């Protein structure tokens, strides 16, 4: 689940159209819900909410805003990995 989020987060920073940003966020969201099932759970409601915020911008046709709005997702995701590896 974390490997899907990180791999597709490079696609957003590389894609240059609303067709590939929306598609990448769809896989990123599908894993975010999947990872949540397995405070830690409340840490994903913020992340999925930020995917909705980025996916809504990329749906309106603003690819440039989506890549700018997906940067804030990188810090939140990196915090969960640091918090999870400490717990395990």
């Amino acid at each position: 689940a974390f490997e899907t989020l990180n791999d597709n987060l490079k696609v957003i920073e590389k894609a240059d159209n609303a067709a590939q940003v929306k598609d990448a966020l769809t896989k990123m969201r599908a894993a975010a819900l999947d990872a949540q099932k397995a405070d830690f759970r409340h840490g994903f409601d913020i992340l999925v909410g930020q995917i909705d915020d980025a996916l809504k911008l990329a749906n309106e046709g603003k690819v440039k805003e989506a890549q700018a709005a997906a940067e804030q997702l990188k810090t939140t995701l990196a915090e969960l990995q640091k918090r999870y590896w400490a717990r395990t």
Epitope: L33, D45, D52, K56
Partner: antibody, heavy 124, light 108 residues
Framework: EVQLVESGGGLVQPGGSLRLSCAAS????????LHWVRQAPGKGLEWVAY????????SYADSVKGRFTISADTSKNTAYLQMNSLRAEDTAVYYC?????????????????WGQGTLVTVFN | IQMTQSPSSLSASVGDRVTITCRAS??????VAWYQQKPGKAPKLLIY???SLYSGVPSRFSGSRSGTDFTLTISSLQPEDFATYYC??????????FGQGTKVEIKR
């Protein structure tokens, strides 16, 4: 009791305009996005359009974008679907769905409550 | 995405067990729902999140998931369970695609 009722379906000339309204009772539209799904007579369900009145977003199916224009009215607690340039493939029964807001359980509920459905037929 | 549902028409007598298979085109995590459309009426939700039972339906309905392959299993049919069952995925608000549709018929 939560219920949704539609109106406005009826005979329309091809290329004409028809307006479908989904009067919502027992809840507030601001707390639940309203979706429209149509069923061609004797076929499977298909998605049409949705409006999230809290955020103002709106999307349409690939086969309908550019013709339909869905709007919501919180004061009257209804959601209107304006249909323009109807063709022969738009004859169906249009259901008005409901769907919770992420996050939490209500998002997982999917289309828990459905409308009665109004028949829209294009006629020569 | 695309959602294939089989069998498209099956027959089973009262008291028999029915398995309906739905297979997504790509991974949809656990976003699958099953509806039951009686002839001439609006569909009703039966299973949501692909495994949970919606409150208000008899307990005989059950769901399952194996990777990207889903299944709706009826433990024991009754004369009130003869209708069309549709398989839906709801991965995102704008990517909703329904299955073809399985119809259950009386066997004689």
């Amino acid at each position: 009791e939560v219920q949704l009722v539609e109106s406005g379906g009826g005979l329309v000339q091809p290329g004409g305009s028809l307006r479908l309204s989904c009067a919502a009772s027992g809840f507030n539209v601001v707390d639940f996005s309203l979706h429209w799904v149509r069923q061609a007579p004797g076929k499977g369900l298909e998605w049409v359009a949705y409006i999230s009145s809290s955020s103002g977003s709106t999307s349409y199916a690939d086969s309908v974008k550019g013709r339909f224009t869905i709007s919501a009215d919180t004061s009257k607690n209804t959601a209107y679907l304006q249909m323009n340039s109807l063709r022969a493939e738009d004859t169906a029964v249009y259901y008005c769905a409901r769907w919770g807001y992420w996050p939490g359980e209500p998002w997982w509920k999917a289309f828990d409550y459905w409308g009665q459905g109004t028949l829209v037929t294009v006629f020569n | 995405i695309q959602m294939t549902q089989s069998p498209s028409s099956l027959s089973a007598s009262v008291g028999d067990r029915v398995t309906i298979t739905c297979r997504a085109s790509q991974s949809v995590s656990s976003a699958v729902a099953w509806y039951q459309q009686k002839p001439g009426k609006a569909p009703k939700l039966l299973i949501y999140s692909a495994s949970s039972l919606y409150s208000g339906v008899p307990s005989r309905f059950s769901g399952s998931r194996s990777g990207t392959d889903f299944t709706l299993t009826i433990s024991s049919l009754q004369p009130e369970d003869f209708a069309t069952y549709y398989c839906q995925q709801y991965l995102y608000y704008s990517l909703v695609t329904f299955g073809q549709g399985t119809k259950v018929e009386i066997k004689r």
